[PDB]
Structure formats: structure tokens, C-alpha cells
Design a protein around this ligand. Structure first.
Ligand code: G65
Ligand code: UDP
Ligand code: UDP
Ligand code: DCM
Lengths: 231, 227
């Protein structure tokens, strides 16, 4: 489509929602599509969404498959509906997504299967499912570049505390670390091999969101806007 | 590309009758229930059908979802078959997506195996699946293979499928009633509005037709002439 698609990636509490908001406000033809999993951190889809997430917190090993499949469905469904937004009849349309279909499977669900929360028959079903739902759409959802909000696992643990979600207070530094490394291996080093080929040659901008960018954000916004010309 | 559904209870006589019809003529093909794709989970062991009967309080959601998505997959694949290339093409589906929700998943939710969250997620999913990908799988006529839950319980034993040799009558009963309330009594209301005016051909399959299937083909040939 005419509408370009950019993915906003990063660790838990790295600064994705703060950045996507700073971008929503800007007077450009940009539409932001939030993470359904973030919308459950607080409708006929939230009712479910909140309950799986609350169940995901309580018993991880039981809900990891139920949750990861409803995350990717509520993401796929959303992102497709965003493409039909006003932007179509807009000049320079850019659609930014809080995370992506690739971040779900490769970074989080994978880590969840590795964490012995999804069994082997559970993982096979998720992988065969994901593979199929992505293949059954096309260039519709294909990313035209990714933005990696790089932050040390320690800034994420202090921002987890900042955010104040009491369910997330328990999250340990090791978990963030384990996530951080899975990000760097895909986005930075690019040693992580996804099923979807096209990702191999996709531009990636890496914004060091370590020091609070909440109010000092003109610097990123420019390095973003230039990144946008190169696509 | 006339799409017919073959509906009925566990071991009522769906494949038997389906495979009698398939042999009968060209331009007639069958889209079986992938109850072996569930039996050996791979990427198109792991017997998601056994784990389900083992502990449904833990596997019913995981199952009905994979059962439904594997169907949508093979049913859609069959429409892109060689049937399109012949006169009078009538494709026969062993059960449907309406069967996977209004009978089996619905019963499991009613039997406490799926908590409300699981059930709501299943409906949310099955609704969006059928709206998007299954916009072409809309049935042209349903054949109901009506058999007592007692007969099914005897055929289940004849079959000797171990995954299900531990099925109580209660279960077969609960399903027999749901198929009656949907296909005979016509009172199981669905999210898919057209279903309301889809012809049904209810055939009693209690008295064995393995070699006495003459009458049933004579009725179905007539049924497919109204369609
Ligand atoms: C919300 C949530 C809350 C708690 C947990 N649980 C854990 O991180 C976790 C807790 C305990 C363990 C330890 N297990 C204990 C039991 N044992 C069987 C195995 C090991 C392993 C993992 C997972 C999550 N799941 C998450 N999903 C996401 C996510 C975001 C975006 C898209 N998809 C998923 C982020 S965090
Ligand atoms: O530069 C930053 C980025 C984020 N935050 C805060 O840190 C928390 C986590 O950030 P965010 O909501 O963006 O989480 P994410 O979407 O990355 O998971 C929130 O309370 C933000 O307001 C902040 O104070 N400064
Ligand atoms: O007229 C019939 C139809 C079936 N069967 C037996 O019933 C079992 C289950 O048959 P089928 O798989 O066709 O039923 P479905 O479960 O597909 O409804 C098998 O062991 C068949 O030999 C039978 O004895 N007589
Ligand atoms: N949506 C569905 C469809 C089928 N089955 C299971 C019940 C039986 O164990 C088996 C019946 O297979 P068939 O009638 O094709 O032999 O499939 C199920 O639990 N849920």
C-alpha cells in the first residue's frame, strides 16, 4: 500500500508508549497503532484480554499458549483495521505499530516456550498457527522499516518501578536481560533467523532511549524523520 | 462447487457413508475431518486429541482452536481442488465449522472444561476466522446422520479407537441432543444468520448400512436435485 508501516520495538518499559504518544501529537500524517497487550494493562475484546493477562500473571505455564494466540490475533485484527484509517486519502502516510507480529513469536513467545511455560505440542500449535495467519494476509502487514528503542535492562527495571503496575514489580532483572539479548540478536547484530525472509533486508534505526527522552525528544524525532526519507 | 456438510454424533457413520458416496461417482469428492492431524501434531507425537480426553479442563481450548483452524485450512484447500474442472461438482465436508462451535466447543464450555475467558476467546476467534478466511465455506445443504447415543457408544467400541474408548453415555447423549436442537428441532440460534434456511437431509443410520446402503443413496440423490 501507499501507507508505509514502521515497527516500534524494545524491552518492557523501555519507552515505547511514551514515544508513540510523542509521535501521535506531532502534526504529520502519522497514525500509531498500540499494542493490544498494553491495552490490557489497565469493550468486547478487553474483557477477554484483561482476564487472560490476569490469568497469565497468576499461572504462566497454563495460560502462555492461550495468551500468546489471543495477543497475535488481537494484533493482526488491529493492524489491518488501521490500514483502512484516514491515512489512505493522506499525503505521506506512515503507520507506526507498538511492537510487531515478529516480536511476539521470536522474542516473547519464544522466551515463554524456552521458560517451560508452553509445552512442545503447545509451541508446535502456536508456530504452525502464527506461520499460517501471517502467510494468509500478504504485503498488507509487511514492515517498511523498524525503530529499535534500545535501553539497558536496568533502565527498564527502574521504568517498570516508575510505571507502578504492581503485577510487574515482581519482574526480575534477569528476565529483562534475557529479553534485551533476544532484541539485540535480532535488531542489532541481526544473528536471529526468522521464518519471514523479507525481514533480513529491512532498515533499522537504533535510538538510545536510556536518558529520559520524555521532555528532551526533538533529537530522536529528527533521527526518525531522516530515517523515514531513506524508505 | 456445491458444498455439503455431513453431520452426526461420534461413530454415527459419517466416514463410512461419506466413502460410499465418494466411490459412486466422479465430480463428488470428500473433505474428511482431520482426526489424525489432531492425533499427530506437526507443522503443516503430540496427540492433542488424547491430551484433550486426558484432561479437558486444561486442553479443550487448545484443542477446539487447532481442530477448527486445521479444518478451515483443509476445507479451503479442497475448494482449489480438481472438482472445479468437472460438471455437477459436489464436495462433501465431514462435519463443519458450525459443528466445531455450536456442538463440541459449546458443550465443553457448558461442561466446565472451558472457563468463560477461554469460551469468549474461542467465539471471538471463530467469529473473526469465519468472517475473514471462511467467507467462501458457506454450506449449500447439510446431511444429518441421526443415530441414538446408544448406537454411537456401540460403534465407538466396534471402531476400537483408544483415544475415545473412555467416552461415557452422558457425553454422547449431550451431543445427540445438540445435533437434534440444531438440525431437527431447529432452535440452536447461531451468529451466522443464513444458516436458518439451509436444507437438511436427516437419515436414520441406526440399522447398519455397510452393505444395506441402497435406500440412503436414493434419498441423497433426490436431496442434491433440490440444490
Ligand atoms: C504478563 C506476564 C506476566 C507474568 C509472566 N510470567 C513470567 O514471566 C514467568 C513467571 C514465572 C516463570 C517461572 N515458571 C514457573 C513454573 N514453571 C512451570 C516454569 C517456570 C516463568 C515466566 C508472563 C507474562 N507474559 C508476558 N507477555 C508479554 C507479551 C508482550 C507482547 C506480546 N506478547 C507477550 C510480555 S510479558
Ligand atoms: O524517557 C522515558 C520513557 C518512559 N518513562 C516512563 O517509564 C514508564 C515505562 O515507559 P512506557 O510507558 O513507555 O513503557 P513501554 O511501552 O516501553 O513498555 C512509564 O511510566 C513512562 O512514563 C519515562 O519516565 N521516561
Ligand atoms: O453403518 C455403519 C457405519 C459405521 N459402522 C462402524 O462405526 C464405526 C465408526 O464409523 P465412522 O468412522 O464412519 O463414523 P463417524 O465417527 O465418522 O461418524 C466403525 O468402526 C464402523 O465400522 C458400522 O458398524 N455400521
Ligand atoms: N470439533 C470437534 C470435532 C470432533 N471432535 C472429536 C470427537 C471424537 O473423538 C472425534 C470424532 O471423529 P469422527 O467422527 O470424524 O470419526 O473428533 C471434537 O472433539 N471436536
Amino acid at each position: 500500500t501507499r501507507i508505509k508501516k514502521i515497527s516500534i520495538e524494545g524491552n518492557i518499559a523501555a519507552g515505547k508508549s511514551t514515544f508513540v504518544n510523542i509521535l501521535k501529537q506531532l502534526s504529520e500524517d502519522w497514525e500509531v497503532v498500540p499494542e493490544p497487550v498494553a491495552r490490557w494493562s489497565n469493550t468486547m475484546s478487553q474483557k477477554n484480554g484483561g482476564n487472560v493477562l490476569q490469568m497469565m500473571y497468576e499461572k504462566p505455564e497454563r495460560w502462555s499458549f492461550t495468551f500468546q494466540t489471543y495477543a497475535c490475533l488481537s494484533r493482526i485484527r488491529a493492524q489491518l483495521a488501521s490500514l483502512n484509517g484516514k491515512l489512505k486519502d493522506a499525503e505521506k502516510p506512515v503507520l507506526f505499530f507498538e511492537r510487531s507480529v515478529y516480536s511476539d513469536r521470536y522474542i516473547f513467545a519464544s522466551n515463554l516456550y524456552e521458560s517451560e511455560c508452553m509445552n512442545e505440542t503447545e509451541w508446535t500449535i502456536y508456530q504452525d498457527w502464527h506461520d499460517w495467519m501471517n502467510n494468509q494476509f500478504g504485503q498488507s502487514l509487511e514492515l517498511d522499516g523498524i525503530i529499535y528503542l534500545q535501553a539497558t535492562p536496568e533502565t527498564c527495571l527502574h521504568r517498570i518501578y516508575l510505571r507502578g503496575r504492581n503485577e510487574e514489580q515482581g519482574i526480575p532483572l534477569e528476565y529483562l536481560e534475557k529479553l534485551h539479548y533476544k532484541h539485540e540478536s535480532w535488531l542489532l547484530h541481526r544473528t536471529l533467523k526468522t521464518n519471514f525472509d523479507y525481514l533480513q533486508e529491512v532498515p533499522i534505526l537504533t535510538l538510545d532511549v536510556n536518558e529520559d527522552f520524555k521532555d528532551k525528544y526533538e533529537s530522536l524525532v529528527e533521527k526518525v524523520k531522516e530515517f523515514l526519507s531513506t524508505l
